[PDB]
Write an enzyme that holds these catalytic residues in place. Structure first.
Site, PDB file in Angstrom:
ATOM      1  N   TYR A   1      39.751  38.374  49.135  1.00  0.00           N
ATOM      2  CA  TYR A   1      40.044  36.947  48.863  1.00  0.00           C
ATOM      3  C   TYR A   1      38.955  36.393  47.945  1.00  0.00           C
ATOM      4  O   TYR A   1      37.790  36.565  48.251  1.00  0.00           O
ATOM      5  CB  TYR A   1      40.137  36.218  50.206  1.00  0.00           C
ATOM      6  CG  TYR A   1      40.975  34.963  50.227  1.00  0.00           C
ATOM      7  CD1 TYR A   1      42.341  35.007  50.001  1.00  0.00           C
ATOM      8  CD2 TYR A   1      40.407  33.747  50.561  1.00  0.00           C
ATOM      9  CE1 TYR A   1      43.116  33.864  50.060  1.00  0.00           C
ATOM     10  CE2 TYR A   1      41.165  32.595  50.626  1.00  0.00           C
ATOM     11  CZ  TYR A   1      42.525  32.651  50.371  1.00  0.00           C
ATOM     12  OH  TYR A   1      43.267  31.507  50.433  1.00  0.00           O
TER      13      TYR A   1
ATOM     14  N   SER B   1      37.944  44.383  52.146  1.00  0.00           N
ATOM     15  CA  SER B   1      38.392  43.320  53.087  1.00  0.00           C
ATOM     16  C   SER B   1      39.922  43.200  53.025  1.00  0.00           C
ATOM     17  O   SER B   1      40.585  44.151  53.456  1.00  0.00           O
ATOM     18  CB  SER B   1      37.642  42.044  52.802  1.00  0.00           C
ATOM     19  OG  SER B   1      37.922  41.043  53.768  1.00  0.00           O
ATOM     20  N   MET B   2      40.485  42.110  52.492  1.00  0.00           N
ATOM     21  CA  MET B   2      41.959  41.954  52.354  1.00  0.00           C
ATOM     22  C   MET B   2      42.522  43.053  51.453  1.00  0.00           C
ATOM     23  O   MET B   2      43.639  43.481  51.730  1.00  0.00           O
ATOM     24  CB  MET B   2      42.345  40.581  51.805  1.00  0.00           C
ATOM     25  CG  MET B   2      42.542  39.541  52.890  1.00  0.00           C
ATOM     26  SD  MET B   2      43.104  37.937  52.251  1.00  0.00           S
ATOM     27  CE  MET B   2      42.661  36.842  53.605  1.00  0.00           C
TER      28      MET B   2
ATOM     29  N   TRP C   1      40.289  43.825  56.308  1.00  0.00           N
ATOM     30  CA  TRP C   1      40.830  42.627  56.984  1.00  0.00           C
ATOM     31  C   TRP C   1      42.355  42.720  56.924  1.00  0.00           C
ATOM     32  O   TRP C   1      42.886  42.874  55.804  1.00  0.00           O
ATOM     33  CB  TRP C   1      40.298  41.339  56.345  1.00  0.00           C
ATOM     34  CG  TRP C   1      40.654  40.119  57.139  1.00  0.00           C
ATOM     35  CD1 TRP C   1      39.856  39.444  58.016  1.00  0.00           C
ATOM     36  CD2 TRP C   1      41.933  39.461  57.176  1.00  0.00           C
ATOM     37  NE1 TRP C   1      40.541  38.401  58.581  1.00  0.00           N
ATOM     38  CE2 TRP C   1      41.816  38.388  58.088  1.00  0.00           C
ATOM     39  CE3 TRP C   1      43.158  39.660  56.522  1.00  0.00           C
ATOM     40  CZ2 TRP C   1      42.878  37.528  58.358  1.00  0.00           C
ATOM     41  CZ3 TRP C   1      44.204  38.803  56.786  1.00  0.00           C
ATOM     42  CH2 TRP C   1      44.063  37.750  57.691  1.00  0.00           C
TER      43      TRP C   1
ATOM     44  N   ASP D   1      29.268  42.076  60.162  1.00  0.00           N
ATOM     45  CA  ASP D   1      30.368  41.424  59.402  1.00  0.00           C
ATOM     46  C   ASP D   1      30.887  40.244  60.246  1.00  0.00           C
ATOM     47  O   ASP D   1      31.220  40.462  61.425  1.00  0.00           O
ATOM     48  CB  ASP D   1      31.437  42.455  59.017  1.00  0.00           C
ATOM     49  CG  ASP D   1      32.385  42.003  57.915  1.00  0.00           C
ATOM     50  OD1 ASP D   1      32.499  40.774  57.717  1.00  0.00           O
ATOM     51  OD2 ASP D   1      33.021  42.889  57.280  1.00  0.00           O
TER      52      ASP D   1
ATOM     53  N   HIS E   1      29.167  41.448  55.236  1.00  0.00           N
ATOM     54  CA  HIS E   1      30.547  41.713  54.742  1.00  0.00           C
ATOM     55  C   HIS E   1      30.548  42.483  53.406  1.00  0.00           C
ATOM     56  O   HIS E   1      31.455  43.328  53.221  1.00  0.00           O
ATOM     57  CB  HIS E   1      31.302  40.397  54.576  1.00  0.00           C
ATOM     58  CG  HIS E   1      32.764  40.572  54.343  1.00  0.00           C
ATOM     59  ND1 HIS E   1      33.533  41.424  55.101  1.00  0.00           N
ATOM     60  CD2 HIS E   1      33.596  39.992  53.453  1.00  0.00           C
ATOM     61  CE1 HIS E   1      34.780  41.358  54.693  1.00  0.00           C
ATOM     62  NE2 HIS E   1      34.842  40.503  53.666  1.00  0.00           N
TER      63      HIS E   1
END
Length: 268
Positions: free
Chosen positions: A59, A132-133, A157, A177, A208
């Site tokens: 993101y 992540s995403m 994520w 994280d 993160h």
């Protein structure tokens, strides 16, 4: 005799190093197809066709957050595409769709005589990575496309379950994280995946962004990324010692490794 084996016998030295053995170049995709923008990293002298990997950020994030993987993997004998998403605010399913579209354009360019990667890519040997995403999107890409040979998500994520995944998956997780906390993403995803070869490397102290461009554990993370991709994209058991063997055992003493989990051995 493995037709997919490329490059000299690996050492701890050469895997922790900044570059692999092969000379590298890159280009900007002129006309991206199903994703925002991309850069393609390719080896000039791998001694045969190589598999291909698409890397997606999270993101708000762009290519710069994850493009260290570009030259690092390319120099070990992969074609790597780092992408910008249509929108910085796309979620995992859209990230996964754009990842697969980027792999599709790599495959297409490898059949385009004017392309620098013309005839360099084994279009049956493809891998997914992302932050992540974008790493959630990598786990979705894997569950939707079991023909993918390797997944290497970092601090993933997602709001899905991955019990169905049969693709070989290493998760790189960051201990501290707060954005994709491991107790509700990474560790559940690892426990959910019962049908595949998998590993989970947990980086000690890591925020993160512990696996992003400029990170201070690039020796360790570069080594597990390359060895995983090389083992499962190229069926190269020369890399098994770094994942399941004596070289792997030596790494566990290091401060940088909070924990490591696997289901070794990975048998042929």
């Amino acid at each position: 005799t493995n037709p997919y084996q490329r490059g000299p016998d690996p050492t701890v030295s050469s895997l922790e190093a900044t570059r692999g053995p092969f000379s590298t170049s890159s280009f900007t995709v002129s006309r991206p197809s199903g994703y925002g923008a991309g850069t393609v990293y390719y080896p000039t002298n791998a001694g045969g066709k190589v598999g291909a990997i698409a890397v997606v950020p999270g993101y708000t994030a762009r290519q710069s957050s994850i493009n260290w993987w570009g030259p690092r993997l390319a120099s070990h004998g992969f074609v790597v595409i780092t992408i910008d998403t249509n929108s910085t605010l796309d979620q995992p399913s859209s990230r996964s769709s754009q990842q697969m579209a980027a792999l599709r354009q790599v495959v297409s360019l490898a059949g385009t005589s004017s392309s620098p990667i013309y005839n360099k890519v084994d279009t049956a040997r493809l891998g997914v990575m992302g932050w992540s995403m974008g790493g959630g999107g990598s786990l979705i890409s894997a569950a939707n496309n079991p023909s993918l040979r390797a997944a290497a998500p970092q601090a993933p994520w997602a709001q899905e379950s991955f019990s169905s995944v049969t693709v070989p998956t290493l998760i790189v997780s960051c201990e501290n994280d707060s954005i994709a906390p491991n107790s509700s993403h990474s560790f559940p995803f690892y426990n959910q995946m019962t049908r595949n070869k998998k590993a989970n490397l947990v980086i000690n102290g890591g925020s993160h962004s512990c696996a992003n461009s400029g990170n201070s554990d690039a020796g360790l993370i570069g080594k597990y990324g390359v060895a995983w991709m090389k083992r499962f994209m190229d069926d190269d058991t020369r890399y098994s010692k770094f994942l399941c063997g004596a070289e792997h055992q030596a790494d566990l003493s290091k401060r940088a490794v909070e924990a490591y989990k696997e289901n070794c051995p990975y048998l042929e």
